[PDB]
Symmetry: C3
Subunit: 148 residues, 3 copies
């Protein structure tokens, strides 16, 4: 279970949907994400693209980070401004994609990947304290504290 | 100590300050960050927003990465262009926020989160080497090496 | 092996190249990257800057993430829109840098860092399964799986 992922398909079986998150090969860090629908992102535009899938099970100690693909960033003048997926998120992954071109539109197509997903190890903090420190004496005052 | 964090409050107790860093849900991988002061980020503007807090103690094997919130990115046409917090950083966390709108200003308000902070596991490299590969033999030549 | 990195220098010894990747302080989580050549990034421009180095060996369970430098971002109105370095990449690291200024050009200079590189712990997925879950009853149907 330590290195296993379960993706949740939103569309009922039998219905046309996006290509599933596909391992990027050659390579080992990313999954390619695909769009459910086709569109053209206008110059300076910001799009929210549905991928047809959610993460049902994350690998242990990992959350998901949606990142831009190098090719499209350079070729289509794009970026992925946000992409932090919490371990409790059950909804459908949606890629936020910005077109930085003042002249060209970005083609979003069924069989072509729009972004990558990486499973990064993070710390799920168990203990937290908020402290105020006297800048002259070094004396500490606990503001508040909590356990998870 | 392995999963514990200590935040340092810059404002004395009883003084006006930003809401403290806080995880919104039990599935939250990131702490929500809040502004100390209210402002309006002009179109195309880049702001450095004070959060009222610093990190006094990091969890073991982790560093702080400030990332954009999805809501704030989509609703206000924003991005967080930088946010690497080194384990030796002793100052107040400041969020760098870009407003991509050519027409609308971004409202920065006291009770509304501007970004989030993740504690990511990184490798604190102990041994490093620069190598040159001889192009006739394939023989590796150590240029330099260092220990931490 | 667990906490060791090997950088590969592309330029021959004796030839002038970029300053090597280096951590600024003992508290640095990232290596400062430097450019092989000098250039000026025009307003609204997107540049692909060669660093003179590649990663020959990654630390165990790590990949390379190129991220923006704080002073460089705030001072020169820049960003690093991409920077995922897969563990199988042996080529030269190239920093993708966007100039957001509509008026000022960005000076790229030999001794000045353009970005930084972090070695982040990731999961190299061994098993993947795509499943359809009924909302009625939590009944699961494996659509596809791979190892």
């Amino acid at each position: 279970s330590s290195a296993s992922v379960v993706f949740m398909r939103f569309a009922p079986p039998g219905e046309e949907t996006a290509l599933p998150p596909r391992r990027a090969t050659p390579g080992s860090v990313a999954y390619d994400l695909f769009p459910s629908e086709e569109m053209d992102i206008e110059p300076m535009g910001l799009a929210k693209i549905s991928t047809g899938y959610g993460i049902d099970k994350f690998p242990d100690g990992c959350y998901g980070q949606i990142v831009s693909r190098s090719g499209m960033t350079w070729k289509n003048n794009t970026s992925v401004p946000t992409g932090t997926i919490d371990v409790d998120y059950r909804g459908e992954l949606k890629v936020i994609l910005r077109n930085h071109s003042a002249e060209k539109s970005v083609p979003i197509r069924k069989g072509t990947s729009i972004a990558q997903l990486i499973f990064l190890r993070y710390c799920d903090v168990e203990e937290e304290q908020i402290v105020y420190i006297n800048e002259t004496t070094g004396e500490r005052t606990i503001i508040d504290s909590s356990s998870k």
